[PDB]
Amino acid sequence: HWGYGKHNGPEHWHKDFPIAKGERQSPVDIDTHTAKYDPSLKPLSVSYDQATSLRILNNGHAFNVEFDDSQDKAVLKGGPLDGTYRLIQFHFHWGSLDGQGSEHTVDKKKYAAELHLVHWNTKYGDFGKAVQQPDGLAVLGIFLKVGSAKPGLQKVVDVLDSIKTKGKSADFTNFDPRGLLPESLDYWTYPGSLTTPPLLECVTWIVLKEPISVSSEQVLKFRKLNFNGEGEPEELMVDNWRPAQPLKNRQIKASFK
Numbered sequence: 195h196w197g198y199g200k201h202n203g204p205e206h207w208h209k210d211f212p213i214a215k216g217e218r219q220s221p222v223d224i225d226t227h228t229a230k231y232d233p234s235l236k237p238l239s240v241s242y243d244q245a246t247s248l249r250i251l252n253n254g255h256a257f258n259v260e261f262d263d264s265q266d267k268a269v270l271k272g273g274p275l276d277g278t279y280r281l282i283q284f285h286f287h288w289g290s291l292d293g294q295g296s297e298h299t300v301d302k303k304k305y306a307a308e309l310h311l312v313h314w315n316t317k318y319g320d321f322g323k324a325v326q327q328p329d330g331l332a333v334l335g336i337f338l339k340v341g342s343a344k345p346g347l348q349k350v351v352d353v354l355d356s357i358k359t360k361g362k363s364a365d366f367t368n369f370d371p372r373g374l375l376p377e378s379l380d381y382w383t384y385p386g387s388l389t390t391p392p393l394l395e396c397v398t399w400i401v402l403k404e405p406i407s408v409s410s411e412q413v414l415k416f417r418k419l420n421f422n423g424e425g426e427p428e429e430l431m432v433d434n435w436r437p438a439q440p441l442k443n444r445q446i447k448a449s450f451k
């Protein structure tokens with residue numbers, strides 16, 4: 195029964211998921227004055243040309259756009275990574291107000307939202323095995339600010355009415371996730387965790403420096419989603435973000451000067 199409310203939000207999660215207090219929890223604040231350039235970090239390779247989106251699902255905490263991950267169709271490689279990571283889904287975290295919503299922060303700045311493109315290491319054969327490994331997942335995180343619309347997000351926005359409530363899904367084929375990327379692939383990277391229960395410490399985080407812009411109308415449509423099921427009391431799906439966690443014995447590395 196975890197969520198983002200007063201009685202079941204992030205400060206409670208540790209009672210069912212004690213790793214919430216672990217050594218490699220996410221998100222974190224990215225201090226741009228202490229992250230160090232690592233000249234040996236390689237450019238990211240984002241290979242999404244053969245991506246096959248399948249479906250969009252409201253899971254009660256966010257919505258996931260799911261992909262066919264049974265072949266190497268949409269993969270992330272390079273950067274800090276060894277091997278090949280397949281895209282399984284993307285989802286977002288967002289706020290009730292434009293001044294909050296991101297999970298990672300940059301010099302304590304919160305963005306309006308944050309996109310997570312979740313990929314699993316093919317050496318582990320399936321997602322469920324990958325999450326049990328320290329190098330199982332690679333998550334590409336992208337900040338959203340409110341400004342101009344993002345044309346490549348509109349197809350997502352327009353389906354949200356069909357998945358208003360928890361457990362609803364809709365067909366969602368032929369969506370191109372390249373339309374969600376900023377111009378630059380400069381990034382920060384560190385080892386961390388899933389940001390929702392089970393909070394497993396299986397993620398190489400790759401957080402892009404450049405945000406994307408979305409319009410006020412686009413974010414407003416995210417805020418009409420519901421945490422609840424159909425025929426349950428309406429609770430708007432907003433503020434579905436975990437705050438920054440202690441960095442502990444980790445270093446954040448930058449791909450750029």
Ligand SMILES: [Zn+2]
Binds near residue numbers: 389
């Ligand atoms: Zn996420």
